[PDB]
Write a protein that binds this ligand. Structure first.
Ligand SMILES: CC(=O)SCCNC(=O)CCNC(=O)[C@H](O)C(C)(C)COP(=O)(O)OP(=O)(O)OC[C@H]1O[C@@H](n2cnc3c(N)ncnc32)[C@H](O)[C@@H]1OP(=O)(O)O
Ligand SMILES: CC(=O)SCCNC(=O)CCNC(=O)[C@H](O)C(C)(C)COP(=O)(O)OP(=O)(O)OC[C@H]1O[C@@H](n2cnc3c(N)ncnc32)[C@H](O)[C@@H]1OP(=O)(O)O
Ligand SMILES: [Cl-]
Lengths: 154, 86, 73, 71, 87, 154
């Protein structure tokens, strides 16, 4: 059975994680623990029976601007992936909900106004649209949920 | 779903360094370069701390942020569906 | 020919020579090395101002709250 | 006069590189070649110093931190 | 003083982003760019995992590595002089 | 009084360190602890009365190779700096000796054949020549000591 999303630490077992996208498997195994300690991003993991990561996603703080207006703080949803063992069962949708609830509970600290995600393929765009993200005016492969839509959704 | 050719201007010394690295990894030259570019591209996009918008796109972005909250059905289902971790 | 748009630097030759060595080591031209370094530093400077230095205490609370378990209702 | 590296690339893979290059203010060629150069240096240092003997590499790291005593 | 002009071809949008960052730091445009270049240059040089040699330089390097050990006076003084912390 | 060089950790106080070169002061305060945890390089510090760093240097493993053979493992001496309070008193030379003795004690593990340093100015080249480094055939601003010369020098 899959544990509650918690911050990645050195006790989590990464090697067997396979979501079917090599680069996203590699990032978890090669870069995630380093990111976690340097504070580049914050990674959250679900575990199975033996501290083995079955799923993960990363959040980072970012800002949107133009051109000199004050940039808008946003949370960027980075990589998100589920072990193939758990595909087609609402786990990824539950990770997006987990991310959305984090964004709500932190939003007023530094004035987060929404959550963005960079779709890395047409497949990912379809998936992100399918759980409630919408294309941004900046880029059709850069999707968003407003803090307003998030808060009203709960 | 079909394959495009990309011809890239490269110094021979730069090409020979990639061939040595591909050899060391037991990878074909094309896979070594494409896997390196894919990994770097996802990193470049995800790690953007400052996202720059064209001015017209930026004001539409601000319009949507301020708009009367209207969550679509997909987002409602995502946020109201209890997690497998209960 | 269209216009060439310029950023003009007065540089000590020893500083220029250090950039040429670093560009060489990276297989980049001098211009790209300097502009890529300035772009990366500029994005860092701007995210740090708006999100950390506008209120360092608010930023730390943000980090604290981000890790706490989300519990709707 | 121009030396080329020839890639067969899926258009979706090319489109992701163009988005990443745009975000970095680099041309497509520079983004791909800089990424390949960085990966190549990493692949070659990892082979010669870590993967030739992983156990020797860990001992290297252990011994590096130990207090040097000449006598 | 003994300063040269370096004229760099830049997209206006890239110039304007640097000006915004320099403003935010209370820095002059030239100092922001030169400090960023200096920091990146020392990092680029120091963190070279693979140091590439021209073939002729490489064989001389190999000759010196294999040579009969003849440590110069300066190196001998460095390695034999006790540190301030050895008491 | 200055402590024995030990690996940098989070308990070391970096803010007051001033060697007179901003970029080298900044690296200690901004990048050294991050490098230490990711394992990019290994940093060693001397401390005074209150766990304040008075001096530091970094070592990293690197390799030399030729254009178009097995690359030659080397230790790179990276940044090296002394608080201005301690200049002109053999501290820096003693840090180079500390580095040299580390290189000797680790050399056989992975076949280190020498120690390199990248001179960042004519001042640094003069200093490095003054404590026993010699210009490499690759680059006059890249200086070296062979493991053979190091071992015989003790
Ligand atoms: C762009 C980034 O930041 S990373 C890119 C996204 N992640 C990856 O590509 C990694 C590899 N893939 C995976 O890990 C998974 O297949 C994921 C993350 C895409 C989805 O995992 P699942 O747990 O199977 O999704 P879940 O069961 O919660 O389904 C949620 C919704 O998305 C849909 N969906 C699931 N997989 C996909 C897919 N591959 N493409 C499109 N839509 C999908 C589901 O049908 C469902 O919508 P519905 O209510 O209309 O039925
Ligand atoms: C380039 C890199 O990768 S590391 C960068 C190191 N260089 C820097 O610019 C750092 C900033 N400066 C400093 O912290 C220091 O002044 C250092 C490291 C240059 C020297 O520190 P000190 O402890 O004063 O040197 P120390 O007292 O051990 O002197 C040893 C020898 O170096 C010489 N030396 C000291 N400072 C210098 C200098 N600025 N230029 C040239 N030689 C110097 C001394 O005269 C002595 O030679 P001698 O015995 O033949 O007279
Ligand atoms: Cl101008």
């Amino acid at each position: 059975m899959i544990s509650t999303p918690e911050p990645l630490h050195a006790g989590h077992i990464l090697t067997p994680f396979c979501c079917g996208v090599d680069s996203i498997d590699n990032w978890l195994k090669q870069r995630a623990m380093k990111n976690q300690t340097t504070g580049a991003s914050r990674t959250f993991v679900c575990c199975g029976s033996d501290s083995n990561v079955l799923a993960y996603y990363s959040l980072a703080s970012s800002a949107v601007t133009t051109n000199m207006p004050d940039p808008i703080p946003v949370v960027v949803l980075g990589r998100l992936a589920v072990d193939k063992s758990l595909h087609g069962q609402g786990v990824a949708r539950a990770l997006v909900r987990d991310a959305g609830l984090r964004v709500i509970q932190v939003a007023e600290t530094i004035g987060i106004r929404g959550m963005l995600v960079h779709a890395l393929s047409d497949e990912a765009r379809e998936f992100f649209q399918r759980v409630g993200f919408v294309p941004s005016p900046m880029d059709p492969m850069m999707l968003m949920v407003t803090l307003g839509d998030l808060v009203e959704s709960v | 779903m079909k394959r495009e050719t990309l011809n890239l201007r490269i110094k021979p010394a730069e090409r020979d360094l990639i061939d040595r690295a591909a050899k060391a990894r037991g990878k074909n030259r094309t896979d070594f370069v494409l896997e390196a570019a894919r990994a770097a591209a996802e990193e470049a996009l995800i790690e953007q701390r400052i996202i720059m918008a064209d001015p017209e796109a930026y004001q539409e972005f601000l319009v949507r942020l301020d708009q009367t909250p209207s969550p679509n059905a997909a987002l409602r289902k995502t946020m109201q569906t209890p997690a497998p971790w209960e």
